[PDB]
Amino acid sequence: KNPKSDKFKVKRFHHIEFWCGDATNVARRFSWGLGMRFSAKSDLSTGNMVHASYLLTSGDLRFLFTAPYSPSLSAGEIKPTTTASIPSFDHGSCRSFFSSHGLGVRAVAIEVEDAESAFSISVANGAIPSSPPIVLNEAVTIAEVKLYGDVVLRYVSYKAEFLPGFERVEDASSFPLDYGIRRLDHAVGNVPELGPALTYVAGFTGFHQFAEFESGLNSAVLASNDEMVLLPINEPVHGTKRKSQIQTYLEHNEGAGLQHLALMSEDIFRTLREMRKRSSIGGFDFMPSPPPTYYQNLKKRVGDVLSDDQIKECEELGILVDRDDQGTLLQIFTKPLGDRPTIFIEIIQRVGCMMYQSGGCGGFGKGNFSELFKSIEEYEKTL
């Protein structure tokens, strides 16, 4: 059931912005680890005396990395005279965010028809304003409201590359890396209390609950009208034998924030081969693979969707598989992206629900908790 209750016209995920202490080193690490190209910049070389911002792209996926310069470089400026290309940026907010949370997502940006309208309707419907609508070069409008913790939902609308004031990156500095990642599938937040978080966000967006089918969490997924913008939210389950990973996140992150980004691949096998080649040479590590009992149990569950060779290829790469009543998904999770056990990345590919592919085809893999537990004691018994 999809009531299509969006209070304003939402298009697609537009970009994700990381707040960094040094944007250069994070962007270069991510570029190599994920196979994303350097595509735009806004920094001292483009006249920006306020912040350094570097944009990586792979397909339609856009990762922005931003860090503050010394405030002394821009001490003469006022907001009317700012050289910042992102007017919502604030030195104090950025430094406070990174010292509080470490490396993490500041903004989940979605493209909308009219960012000023989206902002007004959101705030009229309970959203906490973060940055009012600002029109950039009479061409693009940006506005921000609080999502959870210190994460903002950023509205972007275009009258008609990335943002005014950003320059395209020269070919010499722009190596065409590509490991197959194509777009952001969903972005997941961790909060202490799911109920009030859901009520707040569904309250100001009109996003509806996306239907699903003791793992340490309770979850729910908010979705736009065509279910292409997907925002899951988790809360911890306390008292459990194993401590909730949601609680660990909240402790090390100093509260609520973005837990993981799920990146759709057009060929998850190629993506994982390329990423795993680079894990120990600057890229990303992956969670430990499931036991072979898990892959021995895959024939009975998805043997009609994946060949034996394709299942063996999942085993080689540590890929997980789950299935809806309507589709199948392949997924795998990285280890945390930075020092703290907080944000990580999921790589995903979805099989089915063809019409284009409908959003969320196959679900989000919640069945992989019990299957993993089931594989673990089975492999212990086989030993």
Ligand X SMILES: Cc1nn(C)c(O)c1C(=O)c1ccc2nnn(Cc3ccc(F)cc3)c(=O)c2c1C
Residues flagged as binding site for Fe cation: 186, 260, 346
Q: Which sign, positive or negative, has the C-alpha torsion 136, 141, 145, 149?
A: negative
What is the 3-state secondary structure of the chain? CCCCCCCCCEEEEEEEEEECCCHHHHHHHHHHHHCCEEEEEECHHHCCCCEEEEEEEECCEEEEEEEECCHHHHCCCCHHHCCCCCCCCCHHHHHHHHHHHCCEEEEEEEEECCHHHHHHHHHHCCCCEEEEEEEECCCEEEEEEEEECCEEEEEEEECCCCCCCCEECCHHHCCCCCCCEEEEEEEEEECCCHHHHHHHHHHHHCCEECCCCCCCEEEEEEECCCCCCEEEEEEECCCCCCCCHHHHHHHHCCCCEEEEEEEEECCHHHHHHHHHHCHHHCCCCECCCCCHHHHHCHHHHHCCCCCHHHHHHHHHHCCEEEECCCEEEEEEEECCCCCCCCCEEEEEEEEECECCECCCCCCCCCCHHHHHHHHHHHHHHHC
Question: What are the φ/ψ torsions at residue 217 (nearest 5 degrees)?
Answer: -145, 160
- Can residue 287 be called a binding residue for ligand X (CB under 6 A)? yes
Which does residue 280 bind out of Co ion, ligand X, a second copy, none, counting CB within 5 to 8 angstroms by kind? a second copy
Closest CB to Co ion: residue number:
262
- Can residue 346 be called a binding residue for Co ion (CB under 5 A)? yes
Query: Is 165 or 232 the residue whose CB approaches ligand X more closely?
Result: 232
- Can residue 322 be called a binding residue for Co ion (CB under 5 A)? no
- Can residue 262 be called a binding residue for Co ion (CB under 5 A)? yes
Q: Within positions 223 to 262, which residues make up the interface with a second copy, using CB under 8 A? A: 251-254
Q: Within positions 351 to 370, which residues make up the interface with Co ion, using CB under 5 A? A: 364
Query: Is 23 or 233 the residue whose CB approaches a second copy more closely?
Result: 23
Q: Within positions 44 to 83, which residues make up the interface with a second copy, using CB under 8 A? A: 44, 52, 67, 69-70, 72-73
- Can residue 21 be called a binding residue for a second copy (CB under 8 A)? yes
Query: Is 66 or 259 the residue whose CB approaches Co ion more closely?
Result: 259
- Can residue 344 be called a binding residue for ligand X (CB under 6 A)? yes
Sketch the per residue contact string, 230 through 259, with ligand X: x for CB under 6 A, - otherwise.
Answer: --x------------x--------------
| Cα 281 → chain centroid | 23
- Candidate segments 96-104, 138-146, 183-191, 296-304, binder of a second copy by CB under 8 A: 96-104
- Can residue 365 be called a binding residue for ligand X (CB under 6 A)? yes
Query: Is 32 or 369 the residue whose CB approaches a second copy more closely?
Result: 32
Alpha-carbon dihedral of residues 275, 281, 282, 286, nearest 10 degrees?
40
- Can residue 285 be called a binding residue for ligand X (CB under 6 A)? no
Least Å distance between CB 149 and a second copy? 14
- Candidate segments 124-132, 134-142, 282-290, 325-333, binder of a second copy by CB under 8 A: 282-290
- Candidate segments 32-40, 171-179, 266-274, 367-375, binder of ligand X by CB under 6 A: 367-375
Kindly state the number of chain residues that form the binding site for a second copy, as judged by CB under 8 A.
47
**Interface positions with ligand X (CB under 6 A):** 186, 188, 219, 221, 232, 245, 260, 262, 287, 333, 344, 346, 364-366, 368-369, 372
Site for a second copy, rule CB under 8 A: 20-26, 28-33, 38, 43-44, 52, 67, 69-70, 72-73, 95, 98-100, 102-103, 172-175, 177, 251-254, 280-283, 285, 337-341
